Nucleic acid binder design. Structure first.
Ligand SMILES: [Mg+2]
Ligand SMILES: [Mg+2]
Ligand SMILES: [Mg+2]
Ligand SMILES: [Mg+2]
Ligand SMILES: [Mg+2]
Ligand SMILES: [Mg+2]
Ligand SMILES: [Mg+2]
Ligand SMILES: [Mg+2]
Ligand SMILES: [Mg+2]
Ligand SMILES: [Mg+2]
Ligand SMILES: [Mg+2]
Ligand SMILES: [Mg+2]
Ligand SMILES: [Mg+2]
Ligand SMILES: [Mg+2]
Ligand SMILES: [Mg+2]
Ligand SMILES: [Mg+2]
Ligand SMILES: [Mg+2]
Ligand SMILES: [Mg+2]
Ligand SMILES: [Mg+2]
Ligand SMILES: [Mg+2]
Ligand SMILES: [Mg+2]
Lengths: 66, 70, 153, 117
RNA sequence: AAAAUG
RNA sequence: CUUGAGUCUCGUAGAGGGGGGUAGAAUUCCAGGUGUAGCGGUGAAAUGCGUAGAGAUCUGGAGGAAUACCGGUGGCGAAGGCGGCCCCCUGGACGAAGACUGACGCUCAGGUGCGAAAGCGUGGGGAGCAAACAGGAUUAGAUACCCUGGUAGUCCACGCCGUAAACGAUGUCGACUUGGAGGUUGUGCCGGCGUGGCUUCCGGAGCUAACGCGUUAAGUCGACCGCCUGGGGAGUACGGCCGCAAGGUUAAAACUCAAAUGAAUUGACGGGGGCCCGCACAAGCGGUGGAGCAUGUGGUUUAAUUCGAUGCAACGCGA
């Protein structure tokens, strides 16, 4: 587990940081549960909002089947 | 789950990859759960029941830790 | 049964030919415990088959059995309120048991004079894939093939 | 008619039936077979074995096209999900891609009411 | 599958 | 006066509310291409759809509704409730340092406001779903359950209604009284050690009819309010008030019963679960049910057809 955002002092998760966000989505493009990646709940919420923002801007896919 | 069969990878192995990809994505569970409408009261009840029974089974585990059967 | 410690019974081989399998065939043909009667019937019919095949007694009997032995049968099972016929493989001992029983049954429903003649005629018919024993095997196979989809549980 | 050598098999695997359509890469149907149309009506129609026979019949229905490779598109929860793919591989086709295309709403329309059986 | 009553 | 209550300063988390915009998935529909005999549905079917080309598959378009994953006995809200993303307007909560006011508090009949779903009015909208309704099944019947369809309605604006097992079946405020493991959200110091807010589970004393509750009390106390007085009759009638209506609200009496009821205990039962057994199924072989006759019984007959046994456990039984 262990949370990579707590150990790095992240203020916000930055939807622009695609390289980081891609570690928190599956092959299908879905947000990985925080129980699998060990993210803290506060950072899991920030991360979901960032992923959805990036999906809106087409920096990330909603699905693997667009 | 989009599987592309790899060079020299046999058909059975690509099939197993496709199966694991489907299970990880949980497509079949999504289809099952979406076949009929589940009322919100029903869904909240079922979620609570799952949490309660998970907690109680761990209680059973941690407490059978002490008990000797013979 | 539920407990299942059924140990098999020893069958004395038939006196003339020393075959366990023909001994079981005599047992299947026998009625009312009259074993010598059944033995005379089988021996007479086997003499006839040997003459009409010019091959041997046991070998001609085996040809007939090979043509009557089923390989797959169906077993009923209720599933969702309906009744399914489930195809299953036949163990070899059951293969012989079914073949012998079917041949005896078919012989009994023939119209020839004595039982020995009916048995000889049925055995020859079987040797050329013709009589109602082989027909029974054919319908059993046909049912199993039609229900191949239910081979799983 | 025209030869293709690169086709797509679409497997519509519902709980009651299986439909196999082999199209070209542009989505134009070349042939099709179904479990129901392969000698299976009722309890037998919704079985993996019926789907396998349907896939065999569909491969026979496009033999004249000289199709060599196949991307497989699997849609639905039914029992003919993988038995069709096995049948398509065993008919000499080269499966180069297996994709699940079961449509999943991102919430969407309300499903029918639950059955009280 | 259906499956009432005393 | 400052300790209760409040104000200010900095910050924090949040599906809190109102308005507006937008994204992607999917269903349906419409147009066209490929293609051909089925599709769809069930326990099994049929109705239904399809050679006037369906279903399947691909492209283009229209439209409405909801926001997968995240997501969690997670969060926010007085309660009802609230879930994509973005903006605008806005409510509350909490924390750390202080500074300020100086009992400004608590509760609250009547009053007033808010208040799920369904329903009602006017005007829109209508994909999906779906009361009613129709057909097909099932059945002894089947005004159902199941299937194929399908209209209000579900959606929007505005108004009305004011009720729910609107539940923690637990009124609000405050104080006090051993613990344990978690969740979530702040903050001090240096992973550890503290310290606040909300929250889930377990449990001690005590309490409780028991079940249980147990620092978020159903323990120990104080303040104020609401409510109860056997079961039925009845939350009904009449009247009043409210409502467009549906109805809501306030709320009896006669008469009738000797109970009604709560929790827990032993059984028995279950078309509840689990594990076993039995010629219970299964795998087999031979019978009975048909015939003639023997025998017992029922019935009928008779002067009498003596009496008894008479689901399994009477009927070649007492005999
Ligand atoms: Mg349905
Ligand atoms: Mg009053
Ligand atoms: Mg409404
Ligand atoms: Mg209306
Ligand atoms: Mg309207
Ligand atoms: Mg219906
Ligand atoms: Mg009420
Ligand atoms: Mg509620
Ligand atoms: Mg309550
Ligand atoms: Mg109440
Ligand atoms: Mg108050
Ligand atoms: Mg407790
Ligand atoms: Mg009233
Ligand atoms: Mg009134
Ligand atoms: Mg049996
Ligand atoms: Mg008789
Ligand atoms: Mg008598
Ligand atoms: Mg007496
Ligand atoms: Mg008597
Ligand atoms: Mg008596
Ligand atoms: Mg008795």
């Amino acid at each position: 587990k262990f949370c990579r955002f707590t150990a790095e002092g992240v203020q916000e998760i930055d939807y622009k940081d695609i390289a980081t966000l891609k570690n928190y989505i599956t092959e299908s493009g879905k947000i990985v549960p925080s129980r699998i990646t060990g993210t803290r709940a506060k950072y899991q919420r920030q991360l979901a909002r960032a992923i959805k923002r990036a999906r809106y801007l087409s920096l990330l896919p909603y699905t693997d089947r667009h | 789950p989009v599987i592309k069969v790899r060079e020299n990878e046999p058909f059975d192995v690509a099939l197993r990859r496709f199966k694991r990809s489907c299970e990880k994505a949980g497509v079949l569970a999504e289809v099952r759960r979406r076949e009929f409408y589940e009322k919100p009261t029903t869904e909240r009840k079922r979620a609570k029941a799952s949490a309660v029974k998970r907690h109680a089974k761990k209680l059973a585990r941690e407490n059978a830790r002490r008990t000797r059967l013979y | 049964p539920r407990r299942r410690v059924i140990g098999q019974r020893k069958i004395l081989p038939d006196p003339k030919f020393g075959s366990e399998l023909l001994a079981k065939f005599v047992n299947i043909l026998m009625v009312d415990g009259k074993k010598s009667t059944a033995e005379s019937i089988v021996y007479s019919a086997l003499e006839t088959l040997a003459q009409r095949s010019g091959k041997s007694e046991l070998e001609a009997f085996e040809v007939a059995l090979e043509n009557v032995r089923p390989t797959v049968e169906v077993k009923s099972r209720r599933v969702g309120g309906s009744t399914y016929q489930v195809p299953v493989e036949v163990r070899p001992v059951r293969r012989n048991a079914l073949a012998m029983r079917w041949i005896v049954e078919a012989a009994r429903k023939r119209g020839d004079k004595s039982m020995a003649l009916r048995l000889a005629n049925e055995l020859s018919d079987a040797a050329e894939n013709k009589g109602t024993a082989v027909k029974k095997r054919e319908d059993v196979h046909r049912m199993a093939e039609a229900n191949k989809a239910f081979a799983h549980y | 008619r025209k030869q293709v050598s690169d086709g797509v098999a679409h497997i519509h695997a519902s709980f009651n039936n299986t439909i196999v359509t082999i199209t070209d890469r542009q989505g134009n149907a070349l042939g099709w077979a179904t479990a129901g149309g392969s000698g299976f009506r009722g309890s037998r129609k919704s079985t993996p074995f019926a789907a396998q026979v349907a896939a065999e019949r569909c491969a026979d229905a496009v033999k004249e096209y000289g199709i060599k490779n196949l991307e497989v598109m699997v849609k639905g929860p039914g029992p003919g999900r993988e038995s069709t793919i096995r049948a398509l591989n065993a008919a000499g086709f080269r499966i180069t891609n297996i994709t699940d295309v079961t449509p999943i709403p991102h919430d969407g329309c309300r499903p029918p009411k639950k059955r009280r059986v």
